[PDB]
Amino acid sequence: PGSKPFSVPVLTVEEMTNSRFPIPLEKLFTGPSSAFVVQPQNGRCTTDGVLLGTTQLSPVNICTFRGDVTHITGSRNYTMNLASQNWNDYDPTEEIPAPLGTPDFVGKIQGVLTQTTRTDGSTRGHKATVYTGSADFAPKLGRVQFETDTDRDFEANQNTKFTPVGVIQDGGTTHRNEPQQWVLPSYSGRNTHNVHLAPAVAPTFPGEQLLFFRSTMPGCSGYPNMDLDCLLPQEWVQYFYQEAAPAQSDVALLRFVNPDTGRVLFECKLHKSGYVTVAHTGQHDLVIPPNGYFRFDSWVNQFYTLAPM
Amino acid sequence: PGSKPFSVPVLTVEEMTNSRFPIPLEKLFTGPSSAFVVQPQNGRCTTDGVLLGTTQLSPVNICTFRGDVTHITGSRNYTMNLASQNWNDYDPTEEIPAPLGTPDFVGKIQGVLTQTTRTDGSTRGHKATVYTGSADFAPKLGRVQFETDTDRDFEANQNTKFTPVGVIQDGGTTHRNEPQQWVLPSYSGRNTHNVHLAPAVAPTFPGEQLLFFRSTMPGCSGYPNMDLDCLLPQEWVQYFYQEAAPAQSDVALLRFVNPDTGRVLFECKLHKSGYVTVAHTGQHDLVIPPNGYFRFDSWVNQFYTLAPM
Numbered sequence A, B: 001p002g003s004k005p006f007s008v009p010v011l012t013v014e015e016m017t018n019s020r021f022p023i024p025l026e027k028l029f030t031g032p033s034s035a036f037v038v039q040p041q042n043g044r045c046t047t048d049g050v051l052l053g054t055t056q057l058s059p060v061n062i063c064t065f066r067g068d069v070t071h072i073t074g075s076r077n078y079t080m081n082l083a084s085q086n087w088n089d090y091d092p093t094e095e096i097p098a099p100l101g102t103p104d105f106v107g108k109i110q111g112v113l114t115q116t117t118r119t120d121g122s123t124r125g126h127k128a129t130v131y132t133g134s135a136d137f138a139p140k141l142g143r144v145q146f147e148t149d150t151d152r153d154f155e156a157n158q159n160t161k162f163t164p165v166g167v168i169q170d171g172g173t174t175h176r177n178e179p180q181q182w183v184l185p186s187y188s189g190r191n192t193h194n195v196h197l198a199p200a201v202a203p204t205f206p207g208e209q210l211l212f213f214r215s216t217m218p219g220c221s222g223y224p225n226m227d228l229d230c231l232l233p234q235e236w237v238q239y240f241y242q243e244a245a246p247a248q249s250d251v252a253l254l255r256f257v258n259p260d261t262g263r264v265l266f267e268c269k270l271h272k273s274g275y276v277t278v279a280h281t282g283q284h285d286l287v288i289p290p291n292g293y294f295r296f297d298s299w300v301n302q303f304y305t306l307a308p309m
């Protein structure tokens, strides 16, 4: 009784960042999710500040890789032997699904591989794509592959970084049918089982749906599905981690306030395990004031009936 | 008297992010600064949470641009007519030096320009470089130019984004003599005066130097100087903005603690206007435990003598 008061940050949606790719939030979206399994590994944190899945604290590290590269002779493809984010040896023994910040969806992520030669500080950068559905995508084992626009310029045994930019669609897939944001990679490669996953989430209360914090990933070629939904803004992960306020019940009731009127636009349930539901049926793009924000009002239970959104 | 207690986050250096480019912090550095003018515009915030210069809250937006592009016929260069970060019309009337997150140094920043055609969701991405020392670099007026690897693929009148990756050195400059991280761009173009700048900072107390939060920018070609020093981690900007605790004096005394020994490694002054000094003379790369962190201990004055670092 009397525990440290819980709160959420006073940040608007547009002031916040996607927790699944290093891009700003744009909007709030709700829709039915019974046809997919919602089990992202980035953007996962309890309200009392326990990080889950592959979640880490800074959004700039999400979907980045570091290590050194080995050329696949006769191609423009390179295997990256992963390092830790601070360039130390990779330690696969941590009880996590994959290195923190590893992509948590199946898709073709395009970006740039950069490299510095230690002895003389010479540098180079080339377009690179990682397909996280590849049979050899195995970040948990310390290995990922990149397709590039070169077969000669990258040196072995030198620090190399991948910076993500966006996603592509190619190879005869149907328009907007890749990436597949709710399909988890096999982090140790094809036909191995993932471990230490953050659990799937779903609305269980009748008339409720998940509320998603949505961005549009940049597209770099083709006709990709650029929608990217996270369960928590990255800033909420950062805040809960720092505050570590105890949950007094299973659900924190939040009101979304419009400062231009002083009135509540909608209310929602922030579940203590780190996701949000609203009372709505159907797909809906929320129309919010750009200065709107969430405010924690009270601890309720999972059996609380929300005002329809 | 009795005002809201000030604090700094319990985050390690490696858990934090540079406030001047979207990359993690790596290390702490101190050195003399009397030969340059230290006046960065990103990573500027008072301890009571007032953002300064071109500083905004999420690190992923730093050095990004959005707008639409016009081809310079006969070249592979494009002029970008800037939009707001949320794709609204750019409003140049704000009392800021340039759009929030604009690069605050002179250099050649390489990244990728991405574009989506609205009608059909077709996408494209191409290597692009912005030279922030260019006479026509004029983000305050809503205009910047990009050199690309194409002369045909980008459409006019469609949303286009630049995602930064790293820096280059070329054009016969001396090795490691560009970028120039302490040279501010002319935000309205060559021979116009910058406005609404965050002030330059310098140590004034005898025997003191600035303490810099340092990263290494990826290099994409040539022999660039990749050192990038910020005055405050991005997370400290975010924290002070959120906490808005009043400064009880001009200086917050911080101790850097080593959890592996329980002892203080060094102490420093966090000036209320948002920068840090230490008692040291000379260039020094600080050797810190990776789990070390800063802790606010007391309000002192500018005339407090620190223990030598």
Ligand SMILES: C[C@@H]1O[C@@H](O[C@H]2[C@H](O[C@H]3[C@H](O)[C@@H](O)[C@@H](O)O[C@@H]3CO)O[C@H](CO)[C@H](O)[C@@H]2O)[C@@H](O)[C@H](O)[C@@H]1O
Pocket (backbone or CB within 6 Å): A169, A170, A220, A221, A222, A223, B122, B123, B124, B125, B153
């Ligand atoms: C949609 C385009 O994507 C990039 O061009 C890619 C090219 O797309 C073509 C489609 O495959 C085709 O169905 C039809 O719609 O024309 C498109 C180009 O005219 O596909 C190839 C592989 O087939 C590559 O992936 C190209 O990058 C982009 O550069 C174009 O401007 C379009 O946005």
Ligand SMILES: C[C@@H]1O[C@@H](O[C@H]2[C@H](O[C@H]3[C@H](O)[C@@H](O)[C@@H](O)O[C@@H]3CO)O[C@H](CO)[C@H](O)[C@@H]2O)[C@@H](O)[C@H](O)[C@@H]1O
Pocket (backbone or CB within 6 Å): A122, A123, A124, A125, A153, B169, B170, B220, B221, B222, B223
């Ligand atoms: C340092 C290299 O940078 C990229 O190559 C660039 C190339 O650099 C050359 C230097 O200019 C030259 O002094 C000497 O050191 O050889 C270098 C390449 O062998 O310079 C051109 C323009 O002159 C381009 O900027 C190249 O990108 C990189 O691709 C190389 O691997 C080196 O890191």
